[PDB]
Amino acid sequence: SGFRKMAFPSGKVEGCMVQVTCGTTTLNGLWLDDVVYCPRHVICTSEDMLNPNYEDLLIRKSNHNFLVQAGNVQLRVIGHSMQNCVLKLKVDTANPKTPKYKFVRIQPGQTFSVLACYNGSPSGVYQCAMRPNFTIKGSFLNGSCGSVGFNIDYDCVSFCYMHHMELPTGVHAGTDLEGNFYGPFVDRQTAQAAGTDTTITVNVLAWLYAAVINGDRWFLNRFTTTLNDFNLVAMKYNYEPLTQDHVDILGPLSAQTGIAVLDMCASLKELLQNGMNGRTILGSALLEDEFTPFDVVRQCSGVT
């Protein structure tokens, strides 16, 4: 028992982290096979970050201008190319520590682990969610760019995120491993609107089931609701509308606890309307939304 914001073991990703320096800028890169991936803003100086012409900036750069270091060994750069907002530096040596991997574009509301890095060295690992507004509420300092987000399925690492920037609001933005930003963000030092975020309803319900599994049942009530009635409440509280797909995904948890999804929705409705009254659920005084139904099943079943 117990329920924690658990990250995937980071070893397979630690073996891929490298340092990429171009001119005066140093950030993190991801070495997979004979390619190093990193944010394209590694080629910028602070002067041109206001409105960079990446194509023109990259033209002034040659293979020998990209210094890639893996631990204490230097990698030889034999090719460079820009794909969207990422640079792909072809190196002459395949990473011997390359795990089985995939590049995936995750959906908002899904979760992943982040290995925060500085100068190509890992500092920590934490679990987070891609917000419905495509931002992440991470923990990153200057130099963390190029740190990646990932999920692990047995021996396969699915890389889903590469860190690029911190908005003036303190939230984080980045891309998939093809360099496409999640959300409307651009890699320029300009004010950028993140847009209204919502609470991931399906994750809150998954977490309520995790609470029941781990003994926290004070919030269960004698009521039920309908999808339509619940969604009117979700609207008022900036919760994403619950759909039959979400109910279906919660099927396994509903079966394990014997609590119908709409009965759990009525518990959630009462919590939204009345608050927690000073009580906690799984050590939290707010409704947690950064655990998917899959995360709950994984943590409560012990998938390695």
Nearer to ligand NM0, 45 or 81 (CB): 45
List of residues 6+ apart from 298 with CB closer than 8 A: none
Nearer to ligand NM0, 148 or 250 (CB): 148
CA dist 155 and 146 (Å) reads 23
Q: Which does 164 bind (CB under 5 to 8 A by kind): ligand NM0, a second copy, none?
A: ligand NM0
Is residue 44 part of the annotated active site? The answer reads: no
CA dist 174 and 172 (Å) reads 7
Is residue 41 part of the annotated active site? The answer reads: yes
Question: Is 131 a residue that touches a second copy (CB under 8 A)?
Answer: no
Nearest-CA neighbor of 125 among 10, 292, 5? 10
Question: Is 3 a residue that touches a second copy (CB under 8 A)?
Answer: yes
Smallest separation (angstroms) from a second copy to the CB of 54: 26
Nearer to a second copy, 227 or 276 (CB): 276
Instruction: Name the segment binding a second copy (CB under 8 A); options: 116-124, 186-194, 233-241, 250-258.
Output: 116-124
Chain residues binding ligand NM0 by CB under 6 A are 1, 41, 49, 140-142, 144-145, 164-166, 187-189
CB distance 185 to 227 below 8 Å:
no
Of 139, 190, 238, 273, the one binding a second copy (CB under 8 A) is: 139
List of residues 6+ apart from 4 with CB closer than 8 A: 299
Among candidate residues 41, 80, 164, 172, the one labeled active-site is 41
CA dist 207 and 202 (Å) reads 9
Nearest-CA neighbor of 82 among 138, 130, 171, 22? 22
* DSSP, residue by residue, 169-212: TS-EEEE-TTSPBSSS--SSSS--------B-HHHHHHHHHHHH
Q: Which does 211 bind (CB under 5 to 8 A by kind): ligand NM0, a second copy, none?
A: none
Each residue 194-223 as x (binds a second copy by CB under 8 A) or -, in order, gives --------------------xx--------
Catalytic residues: 41, 145
